[model samples]
Target: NQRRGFLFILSSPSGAGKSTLSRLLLKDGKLELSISMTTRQKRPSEVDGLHYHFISKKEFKRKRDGNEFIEWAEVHGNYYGTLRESVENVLSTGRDMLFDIDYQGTKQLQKKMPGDTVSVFILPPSMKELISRLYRRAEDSQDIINLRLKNARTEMQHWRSYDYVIINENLNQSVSLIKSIYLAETVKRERCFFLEPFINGLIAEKI
Candidate 1:
């Protein structure tokens, strides 16, 4: 009996290192990333389907109206969502899926599929360090950086919503902890449904 796949969600503020940790976690071949659909223009450095499924507002609304999205939200005038069919397909095949989403998305996913979801919140070492990391990236303008910093404070408030919280002071240590969490969840009794029959067979045999 194959175990059902678990939905692993990693959420954090803009510069909290969740993306870096997600990259490291994806190195494990068994895990797959859930590519989100967005009605926002793609950045020059991003690929169409790799970073996000960039669609027009018309298409986005069409899907949303049809109830095709498991969860969706409009942020800063752009729409972002996860496809319900995509998530269902992955879960049915017993393949683990990883999501890099915000707190709102995580909340929606948990409500939709509570039993199968495991969420983690990543925290920066400090606000100063987080701001430094954002500046170091040199990807956004001062105005955008300031906006993200403001939003980061709000995002951090949702840390208590997650099942696990990791303070990302050290990347290696955080990655190790996440890996341990994944392994432990993979072997949970509810997930390992095949165990029951095996134990029953043993009991039925002559002692």
Candidate 2:
């Protein structure tokens, strides 16, 4: 029997460590990272299909027109997109996918693949901590920091839509919580009905 897999969507404000957590999850054998394509310039240490697809604006528009993206969004003047083909390839392999995207993109993805997607929202313990984490990046300007702080509240408004909400007060604890949630979701009866065939096979020998 084919193994079942999941589409895990993780969304957080700019400084909530979603990207870092995503990198850790990608290292697991069962999970694959969904690399986003972007119209922005590539940064240092970023790789195609790992960090992002890094397409030009014209190509991004072309692909968008062709319905290539499962979800796409424009953030801070940069266009970001997740490819539908990449997600399908991972799912076909029976490996779960991890999407590190914004809330708007998450909504779009849910609309496209509602049944398969499990959404998670990561949040800082407090706004003060959130701002501190934003500055810890050492890359954001004051304007960007302010914008992130403002947008974080707006993002939190959609937290109720997520299947899970993780407060990232402690890294180890948060990781454990996420793992527990995944374990519970895997046993969901709706997704694991294929087990009936295996059970029947075992009972055949008893008869």
Candidate 3:
């Protein structure tokens, strides 16, 4: 009896700490991170295949045109997409996969494979705090920071579409809550294919 694995999606605004939470979740050996393909230039600290499958614009277009991508989008003049084959392979083998994508990608996954997908939206305690976090990073220019702030507001509005929502006021607490969610989802009856036979065996035995 092989159980079906689920697609666990995590989405948040720019400064909501979803990435940090994702890193914590990946520490569990049972969960695998979904590697995305991109047409963006690789950063100095990022590895080729580990961080992203860096590809040319032509290759990106070819795959996108062929409908091989489960979800594809352009952000800041770069293309990024999740491969359909990669996702299917992971789920078919009973290994759970995690997605660190935006709300748009979450919506696509929900639409395409609603039964297999569970999404969580992370929120900061307050907008002021969120802005402060962004500034502390010191990675982006003021213009870019302002843009992300603007987008964050729109992204927050989509919280209603997700299955779970976590306020990232405390890192440890949020991680614990998400871990509990994963464990509960893992043992759900619908995903446990071995349960039926186990119950049948019990029914056939004389107590």
Candidate 4:
């Protein structure tokens, strides 16, 4: 409630090194993440819902029609959404959240949190490289892989909505650039509640 942090969102084409980037950035510390709920299965290297909750399509659909999600999107016939409570809990305690939702979902998030959203778009170096990254994981089947490429084609068009755009060919470079962006956003005047007190107190004491 008092001096809350931002909704740090990373928008990118699927398999374009973004998952790696989010992991590297998050592992370093200071950001919190709430996994999304999805109707798809996980990979061999995946855990039970650390990446997302694998609920049945029926249940997910019920929850969706009930209007429970803060934001939701039906991508390639698969559902991905966030419950309202989790987001409120994160922001209520002055914690920053890292989000990996679609461009469609980001609009409502921004509508709800306007000044508290910092969006960044990550891009691949080339189409060949981007498509290559898709199959490298070798998950379920052609369904998700084809969908990733399918969604990616349209997703890139909305990159302009993000405040920062990073053509992420290398993680090392991205780590630095993203950290600098976070640092700057953290000190934004409206978010810094102590600024007025620090300055006014200085004047009152004749400093």
The per-residue C-alpha lDDT of model 2 at residue 114 equals 71
In angstroms, give how far residue 17 of model 3 lies from its true place.
0.5
- Per-model TM values vs. the true structure: 0.95, 0.91, 0.93, 0.87
The C-alpha lDDT values of all candidates are 0.89, 0.82, 0.88, 0.83
- lDDT string for model 1 (19-135, tens) is 889999999677899999999999888898886999999999999899999989876679999999999898888899999888888899889887788999989889889988998
Each prediction's RMSD over C-alphas, in Å, is 1.3, 1.8, 1.6, 2.5
Backbone collision count in every prediction?
0, 0, 0, 0
Clashing residue pairs in candidate 4 are none
lDDT of 4 by residue, 100-163 (tens): 8778888878887789899889988988888788877765377887778878889998886788
Which predicted model would earn the best TM-score? 1
Off by over 4 Å in 3: none
lDDT of the structure predicted as candidate 1? 0.89
Whole-model alpha-carbon lDDT for candidate 4: 0.83
The TM-score obtained by model 1 is 0.95
On a 0 to 1 TM-score scale, where does candidate 2 land against the true structure?
0.91
Lowest summed lDDT across 10 adjacent residues in model 2 is found at 22-31
Candidate 1 clashes between residue pairs 3 or more apart in a chain or in different chains: none
